[model samples]
Every structure is written in C-alpha cells, then in structure tokens.
Target: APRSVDWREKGYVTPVKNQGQCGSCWAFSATGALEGQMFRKTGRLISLSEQNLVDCSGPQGNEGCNGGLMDYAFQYVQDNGGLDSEESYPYEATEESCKYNPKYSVANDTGFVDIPKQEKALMKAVATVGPISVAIDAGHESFLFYKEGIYFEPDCSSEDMDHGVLVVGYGFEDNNKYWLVKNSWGEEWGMGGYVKMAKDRRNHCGIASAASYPTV
Candidate 1:
C-alpha cells in the first residue's frame, strides 16, 4: 500500500531458476515462492528449502545463505515449524548449520503482504495471491544465470545485486513479441535465467514487487 508503479511491461518472471552460486538471494526468495505455493497447494512442483530457509534462522541471522528477506523468509516459516527439501537443507549457496526437523509439515500462518509503497498494488496483490517476493536491479552478472533469453543485460555491472525471484506468470512472447519470462535458472539461463521487464519510457523496468505471506 505504499509503492505504486507504472511498470507496464515485463511484470511476470517466475520459473527457470537457480542461485546455485548462492549469495542466497534470501534463499531464492524463500525457495522461489515456496515453489509457487507448492504448485497451488500440492500440485507438487517440489524443490523447497533455500538451505532450509537459510539454516533455520534460529536467531534469524540471515547470514546463512548470505542474504534474505522474503518477508524475513515468511516470518521464519511462520515461527519455525515448517520447511524441508533441497533434499533437507542442501542449497549451500553460502550459509548453513541450523538444522531442524520437528517432523516437518505445518501450515496455518498464511500471513504476509506489504507493498505499502504500491508497486501496482504489488502487482495486483501478486496476481490474486499465491506466491510473490521480488527484488530486481540485479545489476551484476557473477555467473548467476541459465537458459538465458529474456535477460538481455546490454550492460553488465555487479552491484552485489542481492538476488531473489518468483512471479510465476505473464505473457507476449516470440512472433516478435517481447515479454516472456520465467526463471529459477536451472533450465539453462535467459529464457531460463529469465528476463524481459524491458520498457523504460515510464514502463516496467522498475522491477520490485512480490509479497506473499502464505495467503495474505
């Protein structure tokens, strides 16, 4: 409710991801929107753990995966009681050690949503809510990419560009169409590393919107 935006272009970039190098863009934006809310509640897209939300953030010392803030990793998985996969804390992009296993499986704290700065009502409340957590201005290219297509970085510079991704949907590709993206980087880069927020004459390039707190 604060960061309103006019980013009228490339506003959806979700799949094809990988911060494998691991400065832990906040544990891949809380395991990339918990892998799109576990594919809309158990449709099963798996791979969730951004190193177990950066080593269970016991004292919340986000230094584990190197960086974090997908709303403090969804308030530390809603006060520590849920999380696993990445084959049980394996992303090791940087930080690790806070192992946890309360036997996993806990869900009820569906709470999180804050774009008071209104980035188009945080992309229309993350396109009717499910998974959203973004931070782009990824001004560096220290080899954090794959399936490279939409990420036309005409100019490369590394601003320690803290990473994190998830948006899950959008359109307009090929046939000379411009905005078509999705990233997790595992698919290869570009089309995989994802990109296409390219329209700056008062259009989408301000890239920063995605806030998901279970279902807030």
Candidate 2:
C-alpha cells in the first residue's frame, strides 16, 4: 500500500453530509462507499441518496432511522436494482415511506466485500478499493465534540461498535498514524465533517472490526 491515500483529494468523495437527529449514519457510510466506487468505475462523482436506504431498506434488515448495517444497505441496493441520486431522493433525516424509483437510479453495487477484523486489511481496502464503510465505537463524549488532531480514546470500546463512518484515507502526522474518517455529524463538527482517527493502535474504537465496501 502507499504511505498515504486521500479519496477526497482525488475528487472521488462527495461533500460531507449531516444525519441530523436521526440514527442514519449507516446510510451515509454506505452511500459514501458506493459513491467512491461509482466514481472510480465511471469517472463520475454523483451523490447517491441516503434517504432511499433509510426509507426502503427496512425489509432488508435495516432498522430505518433507528440504526442499520452497511452490508445490509449494500444488499438492499443490489437487490433493488440500484439506488437513486440525492437530487431524486434527498435526505430528510427522518424515517419515511419508500419512494424509490428505478428510473431515477444513479448507482448500483454488484456486491460488496467485508474486510477481516484487522487494521491491515482495512488499510489495503481503503488504499485500493476506495472509501470503505466501517463501524466504530463513537459513544465516548470526546467523540461528540471532536475537533482537529488525531482522535484516540483509550476508553472507547472495540467490541461494542455502534456508529458507522467512512474511511476515506490514511496518513501520518507528527509521527502519529491516523485514518481520515468521514462522519455524518455535519460540516461544523470535527474538521469539516471529518476526523483523523488514531491508526495502528489495536484497531482502536473497532474501526476495522466491521469494515466493508461496495463493488462497482
């Protein structure tokens, strides 16, 4: 793998988004991964709809706004033929009825692969497969108010992953290895809706415990 990789700098990542009061972080994470793969395959950076998953993926084992899983969302997209664009199915940040229209589909995933519960596997995935969807323990108070700098919470759980995010890149700063993560807490939070999470620290916060990425 390269020493560093940032999909944002490569123009494959979409603008950071906000999930609001809803527990729809999984939708953002899933869409981010799909968007990255879509861009890599088609050379088009189109924003996919998170609302489509939040409203329609319940039958696929996703709990709508309450919570969901990235793998399940990928299955939902594949089984549903494809997913609509953000312009066609804008995010409301609230659970609503499914309004997905195949005619408005913008991207589709043939399938997805789950990385092993190892940081090295995740690093390779992000470096070669584009952005990846990962689950992490973001229950710590510090995570809620995270700003610039490498985020490392020793107290954060590695087994009780609860939040979903996107691993856009990885690099080192001041000798501290970190994963450039994209969050759904809005641009005002963290470093413009992103965080540099501590890397090479036993997969702190379970960032690699449940990593996966869509295949275009």
- Residues 1-216, candidate 1: write the lDDT tens digits: 212221213322234546676666666766666655555665555666676777776465566645657777777776775677666556656665777666644232355566543345545655555456666556555234434334444453222334556554433333222232344556665553555544221223334433443541
Q: What is the C-alpha lDDT of each candidate?
A: 0.52, 0.94
Q: Which prediction has the highest TM-score against the true structure?
A: 2
**lDDT tens digits, residues 64-161, model 2?**
88999999999999999999999999989899899999999999989899899999999988898889999999999999989999999979888899
For residue 198, give model 2's deviation from the true position in Å.
Answer: 0.5
- Give the clash total for candidate 1: 39
How much is 157 displaced in model 1, in angstroms? 36
Model 2: per-residue Cα lDDT at residue 9: 92
For model 1, what is the error of residue 164's alpha carbon versus the real structure, in angstroms, after optimal superposition?
12
Where's the lowest-lDDT run of ten residues in candidate 2? Answer: 166-175
Please report the TM-score between candidate 2 and the true structure.
Answer: 0.98
Off by over 4 Å in 1: 1-18, 21-26, 29-52, 57-76, 81-92, 99-126, 130-165, 174-188, 195-213
* Ten contiguous residues minimizing lDDT sum, candidate 1: 2-11
lDDT of 2 at 126: 89
Q: Which portions of model 2 show Cα errors greater than 4 Å?
A: none
